[PDB]
Structures are given as C-alpha cells and as structure tokens.
C-alpha cells in the first residue's frame, strides 16, 4: 500500500504545516501537524476541557463505531517550545492520504496548554519519530508509520514541505518526479528516539564551505533551524544590523535586509536554503525588526533541522531495519 497527502502551511510564515487525517467510522477529518520529532498521535476531542478549545475541530470517539477505549491508558507530553497536552487513549481506524491503519492509538486530549488553544488551525499532532518516544502509559503505543510499515510497498515516508505553498507527505514510495538530481542518504542514530544524523558542514551565502560535523535531528514539527552558536554567529555576521536580542529571544535583523542563503552538507551533497526562507517577518505587527529563521541551539541541548532546512529539500525517512535519511534538492 501507499498514501499521499497534501500538507499546507497554517499561516503566511510557514510556522507549521497541517495535513488532513481521517479518524474513525464514519470518518472525522482533523488537520494534524505531522511531527518527525515526536511519537504521539493526539487530538483535540470531545473530552478536551471546554475552555481550552477555541475553533479546533474535535474528535468525538462516541460517534465512531470503530473507536474503543484503551482501558487504563493515559498520555502526557511536553514539547521543546514549552507546550504540553495530556489525556486518555482510544484505538480507532486512521487514514492518511488513502493509507489506512486499523487499531491506531488515538490519544484524546483532556488538557492542552495555552499555545495549542490559541492556534485554531492545528487539531492535534501525528508523531513520526521512533515509537520508543511514545508517552502512552502503562503500555507504550506505536506511531502511525510503525503500524503501517509492514503493509507499505517500501518502509519509507517522505516530506516535501513547501515554501509559502503546500507540499506533500508520501508513505510507502519515493516520488522520483518530486526532486532534482539524486538523493543522498546518510546514517541515522535512533538512540534518542529521533531521526538523528550528522551534517558534514555549512556555508553562508557564497562563502566557502566549512567541513565540520553537526549532529542534529530532522524535525518537521519545529519551525526553525537551530544550530551551534558558532555557526549561527557566522551566518548573522553577514547581515548588516543583525543581532541577538535577549528580550525578543533570538537573532533579529532589519526587515530592509536581503538575507544570504545557508548551505548544509549531507555527505558530499549540499542543500541550499535560500535567504528568503530565513525571514520570519516583523517581531510584532508594524515593526521594522524581523525574526531570524536560523537560531542558536545552545539552550536546547540538540541541533534541530526544522522546517526552514527541511523545506529546502525532498527528505526521505527510511524506516528499514537500519533507518537512514535521504536528502535531495528540488
């Protein structure tokens, strides 16, 4: 089997991407944030505290003839941005782009943190990291990809995120018309539960490539590119007037600036992030200070190849017995 679904930016900045997902019988379609940096499929639901729902579409398990409470199971998750959610668990039929999994754990939110309530465009998350990170207790549950894997034509999914435009998540096949050149594959460590890999270096604009190992994670659920402070300083030093602002929370730059590109290495190959992709717009409405799309990871503990980086590539998440990542230009 295969599946193919369009993913759409939630706003004009590409802060996140939503992908329609069919849950239950008859189908309830929710728009979920596909997150290769986490491993829970959770949804706003009829069980979510009413004051914490503001415009999201909810899953109502009592209206699904295939829903079954997973007795005793609870979940609770915290994300790198400080947001969180928790609740109980049903199993139900879940379909993405024509690919159907029966008995998928659907984690129903009883509580969500304010940032989720305040974003009416995201009805939940669909985790695509390794199932070892799934938070369901006392019986850890598998991700949608893990459950689908055996049925797929090939044990892979691909992320083709758009810049200010829709893109595609495919399951079970590699669309050879969706990229240019060849796909360069690179080794993955699953020791932390992530799609963790080592970039071979970087360049700023037309500058020379610096060969240096940068370990980080391919994370579709993180907006920005978080890299070591040395690398980030080298980038922003090429933007007149850019500076790190403690009060704003990162590097800002004059909105009148033209940003240089940023290149990262994948083996001997190179992925170029155009300068435009690094502009996240005014820090507040009407400001002439703009927020940068490349930020320091120094306070995170891990480097994160988020959407800023991934949207410049066609990305293969190869879930074979020994997982690998592939990157192609497009």
**HEC string for the chain:** CCEEEEEEECCCCCCCEEEEEEECCCCEEEEEEEECCCCCEEECECCCCHHHCCCCCCECHHHCCCCEEEEEEEEEEECCCCCEEEEEEEEEEEEECCEEEEEEEEEEEEEECHHHHCCCCCCEEEECCCHHHCCCECCCCCCHHHHHHHHCCCCEEEEECCCCCCEEEEECCCCCCCCCCCCEEEECECCCCCCEEEEEEEEECCCCCEEEEEEEEECCCCCCEEECHHHHHHHHCCCCCCEEECCCCEEEEECCCCCCCEEEEECCEEEEECHHHHEEEECCCCCCEEEECEEECCCCCCEEECHHHHCCCEEEEECCCCCEEEEECC
C-alpha separations of 29 from 12, 85, 102, 138, 159 in Å: 23, 20, 16, 28, 21
Same domain, 197 and 60: no
State the CB neighbour count (10 A cutoff) for residue 219.
28
Residue 311 CA to residue 223 CA, distance in Å, equals: 10
Chain breaks in the chain (C to N over 2.5 A) after: none
- Check: CB of residue 148 under 8 Å from CB of residue 157: no
* Domains identified in the chain, total number: 2
Residues with catalytic roles: 35, 199
Q: Which residues pair with 227 in a beta bridge?
A: 296
Rg of the chain, C-alpha, whole Å: 20
Which of 237, 282, 273, 10 lies closest to 122 in space, CA to CA? 10
Q: What are phi and psi of 133, to 5 degrees?
A: -90, -5
Residue 131 CA to residue 39 CA, distance in Å, equals: 6
Which of 84, 100, 80 lies closest to 92 in space, CA to CA? 100
Same domain, 148 and 203: no
Same domain, 298 and 163: no
Same domain, 66 and 134: yes
Peptide bond into 241 cis (omega under 30): no
* Residue at a domain's end among 123, 155, 174: 174
Domain hosting residue 69, numbered range: 5-174
Residue 106 CA to residue 44 CA, distance in Å, equals: 10
* Residue at a domain's end among 174, 209, 244: 174
Q: Angle at the Cα of 105 (from 72 to 59), degrees rounded to 5? A: 95
Pairing of strands 262-266, 269-273: antiparallel
Same domain, 33 and 166: yes
Same domain, 36 and 128: yes
Residue 133 CA to residue 125 CA, distance in Å, equals: 14
Q: Tell me the technique behind this structure.
A: X-ray
Residue 68 CA to residue 24 CA, distance in Å, equals: 10
Pairing of strands 225-227, 294-296: parallel
Q: Which residues pair with 44 in a beta bridge?
A: none
Same domain, 27 and 168: yes
Same domain, 29 and 52: yes
| CATH number of the domain bearing residue 287 | 2.40.70.10
Same domain, 183 and 316: yes
Same domain, 147 and 292: no
The answer to whether the Cα torsion of 210, 16, 88, 96 is positive or negative is: negative
- Check: CB of residue 42 under 8 Å from CB of residue 107: yes
Same domain, 132 and 256: no
* Residue at a domain's end among 120, 143, 174: 174
Same domain, 202 and 159: no
Residue 207 CA to residue 200 CA, distance in Å, equals: 16
Q: What are phi and psi of 274, to 5 degrees?
A: -60, 150
């Amino acid at each position: 089997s295969t599946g193919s679904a369009t993913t759409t930016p939630i706003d004009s900045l590409d802060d996140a991407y939503i992908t329609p997902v069919q849950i239950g019988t008859p189908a309830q379609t929710l728009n979920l944030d596909f997150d290769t940096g986490s491993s829970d499929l959770w949804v706003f639901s009829s069980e979510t505290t009413a004051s914490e729902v503001d415009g999201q579409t909810i899953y109502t398990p009592s209206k699904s003839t295939t829903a079954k409470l997973l007795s005793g199971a609870t979940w609770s998750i915290s994300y790198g941005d400080g947001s969180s959610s928790s609740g109980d668990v049903y199993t139900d039929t879940v379909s993405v782009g024509g690919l159907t999994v029966t008995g998928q754990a659907v984690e129903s939110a009883k509580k969500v943190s304010s940032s989720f309530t305040e974003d009416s465009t995201i009805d939940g998350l669909l985790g695509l990291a390794f199932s070892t990170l799934n938070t369901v207790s006392p019986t850890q549950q598998k991700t949608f990809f893990d459950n689908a894997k055996a049925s797929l034509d090939s044990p892979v999914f691909t992320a083709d995120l758009g810049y200010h435009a829709p893109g595609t998540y495919n399951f079970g096949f590699i669309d050879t018309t969706a990229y240019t050149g060849s796909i360069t594959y690179t080794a993955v460590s699953t020791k932390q539960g992530f799609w963790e890999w080592t970039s071979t270096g970087y360049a700023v604009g037309s500058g020379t490539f610096k060969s240096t190992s940068i370990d980080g994670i391919a994370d579709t659920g993180t907006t920005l590119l978080y890299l070591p402070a040395t690398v980030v300083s080298a980038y922003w030093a090429q933007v007149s007037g850019a500076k790190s602002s403690s009060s704003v929370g990162g590097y800002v730059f004059p909105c009148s600036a033209t940003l240089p590109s940023f290149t990262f290495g994948v083996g001997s190959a190179r992925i170029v992030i155009p300068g435009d992709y690094i502009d996240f717009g005014p820090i507040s409405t009407g400001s002439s200070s703009c927020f940068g799309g490349i930020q320091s990871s120094a306070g995170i503990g891990i480097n994160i190849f988020g959407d800023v980086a991934l949207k410049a590539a066609f990305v293969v998440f190869n879930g074979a017995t020994t997982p690998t990542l592939g990157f192609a230009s497009k």
